[PDB]
Design a protein around this ligand. Structure first.
Ligand SMILES: [Li+]
Ligand SMILES: [Li+]
Ligand SMILES: [Li+]
Ligand SMILES: [Zn+2]
Length: 433
């Protein structure tokens, strides 16, 4: 199983049941801000600042309400549609349990404890105030929770895990408050909504020449969904600290003949998140530019804080909140009480969020087999069920100790462990070659 850190308290202290009655505190009907008459949805608070909505995401993007698969002629190769998935209470219960178990698997590693700790500390900056003597929240970093008396209270949060939209296997991140400010790239950060399903996973090939070839392999090995959730959490970490890289900054891939011949491009933000050898394809000149840019945004935040002399609202005091951001951005404070950004500390924080928290490093912690590069081609999608401990555990994922699955990644081998995988679609050969 994974490289452990030793006994620790669970990341999720409640074992939620989807049908548990609402209590208006950590099981509650909620509404996202600026949603007009949206019907409330039942949501579950799994940890401070992190909530789960076990519903398909028909609510975040106005462009994405229909779960119905488009016309067969219309659908891309790597996609999968099922308008009924996550429609029933039992599925929702399973979803909650599956997401819970993957957070616990992540938090059982030191790397996962570090990332989840950064995520909880990464409170979206209070950049809301029209005037600078006052520090105000940005209310799109909050949700509206129905209390037991039927009234709404607003609650700040950092992360919401929600079910996918129409394409089940597209795990996008939506966030709010960026119609003018690019909150995920200006140091501020914003609450992230990650579309994710612990009920499906992807097949990959164990040979590099086959996995990076769009015509070969059927997806013999299944990706551990804890790696996939970690990958989304790393993106969310960059976005909560406001240092995600504009997706228009791309590597025009020329290290893989098949990518090149199709003119496929991959964002720097993906190479960064993958890590390993992939991050080296980020142009160093551009990377150095990015660091300087984010460093300056952090200096803007320190200046903003410095001007604030009163807080708005009654959740927390001005001193509490100045300290929350001093912590978050690791600001220095002078004899006079002025905050500044220390270059050394900035370099440490940026490196932690962008080099230490990477997919490739998570693979090392989990001791799982995984794609060796992001520059590969997906092979297949599988239906799985990680909830029963006979199928998947916090410590071992699929590669269960004291079974024939413990060695050689047998548990991820979808031919040996075939009871744990139902292949839903082949992608190989549907590629545009
Ligand atoms: Li279904
Ligand atoms: Li186990
Ligand atoms: Li199967
Ligand atoms: Zn990604």
């Amino acid at each position: 199983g994974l490289v452990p850190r030793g006994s620790h308290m669970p990341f999720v202290n409640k074992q939620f049941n989807y049908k548990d009655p609402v209590n208006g505190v950590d099981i509650a009907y909620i509404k996202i801000p600026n949603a007009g008459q949206m019907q409330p949805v039942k949501a579950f608070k799994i940890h401070n600042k992190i909530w789960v909505i076990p519903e398909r995401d028909t609510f975040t993007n106005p462009e994405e309400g229909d779960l119905n698969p488009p016309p067969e002629a219309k659908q891309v190769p790597v996609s999968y549609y099922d308008s009924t998935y996550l429609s029933t209470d039992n599925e929702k219960d399973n979803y909650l349990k599956g997401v819970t178990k993957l957070f616990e698997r992540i938090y059982s590693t030191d790397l996962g404890r570090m990332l989840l700790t950064s995520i909880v500390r990464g409170i979206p900056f209070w950049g809301g105030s029209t005037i600078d003597t006052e520090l105000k929240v940005i209310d799109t970093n909050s949700i509206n929770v129905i209390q037991p008396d039927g009234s709404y209270r607003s609650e700040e949060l950092n992360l919401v895990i929600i079910g996918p939209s129409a394409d089940i296997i597209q795990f996008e991140c939506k966030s709010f408050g960026h119609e003018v400010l690019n909150l995920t790239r200006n140091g501020y950060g914003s609450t992230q909504y990650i579309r994710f399903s612990p009920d499906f996973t992807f097949g990959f090939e164990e040979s590099l020449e086959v996995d990076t070839n769009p015509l070969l392999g059927a997806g013999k090995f299944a990706t551990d969904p804890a790696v996939t959730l970690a990958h989304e959490l790393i993106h969310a970490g960059h976005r909560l600290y406001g240092i995600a890289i504009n997706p228009n900054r791309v590597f025009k891939v020329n290290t893989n003949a098949y990518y090149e011949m199709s003119g496929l491009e991959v964002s720097f933000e993906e190479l960064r998140t993958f890590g390993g050898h992939d991050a080296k394809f980020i142009d160093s000149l551009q990377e150095n530019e990015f660091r300087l840019y984010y460093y300056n945004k952090f200096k803007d935040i320190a200046s903003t804080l410095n001007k604030a002399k009163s807080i708005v609202g009654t959740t927390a005091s001005l001193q509490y909140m100045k300290n929350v951001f001093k912590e978050k951005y690791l600001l220095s404070e002078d004899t006079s009480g002025k905050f500044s950004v220390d270059k050394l500390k900035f370099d440490k924080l940026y490196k932690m969020l962008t080099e230490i928290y990477t997919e490739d490093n998570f693979v090392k912690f989990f001791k799982v087999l995984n794609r060796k590069t992001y520059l590969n081609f997906d092979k297949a999608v599988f239906k799985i069920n990680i909830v029963p401990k006979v199928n998947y555990t916090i410590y071992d994922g699929f590669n269960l100790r004291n079974t024939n699955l413990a060695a050689n990644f047998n548990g991820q081998n979808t031919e040996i462990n075939n009871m744990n995988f139902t292949k839903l679609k082949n992608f190989t050969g549907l590629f545009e070659f």
